[PDB]
Ligand binder design. Sequence first.
Ligand SMILES: CC(=O)CCCCC/C=C\C(=O)O
Length: 117
Amino acid sequence: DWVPPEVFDLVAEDKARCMSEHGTTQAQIDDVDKGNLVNEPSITCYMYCLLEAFSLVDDEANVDEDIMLGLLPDQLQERAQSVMGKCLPTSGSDNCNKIYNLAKCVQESAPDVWFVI
Ligand SMILES: CC(=O)CCCCC/C=C\C(=O)O
């Protein structure tokens, strides 16, 4: 992708923790990455969990746009601001479901640059 390998090491402890907490499998993550998203807590609560580990969302799955933007390469800033304009604020029944809807929105809007670690 555009995601550099250093980022995988950085997320490794939290990834292991969030998969363990939520019953997530690598296969589920690969599915999401392949654009296939279902409203299963084991995947959706994983995504919320990891986002939270990096202060990208708060206790009610409100996205920190600035942190999100500061994390992305300089190239995607422009298209990411557009995707956020369409897909934020988050909404849903709970934290996991809010990230499910966000994931659905962001994938529908910017498949090219869609991905989850
Ligand atoms: C849903 C998902 O995988 C997003 C993970 C965000 C983690 C990024 C952590 C560190 C960085 O980008 O430097």
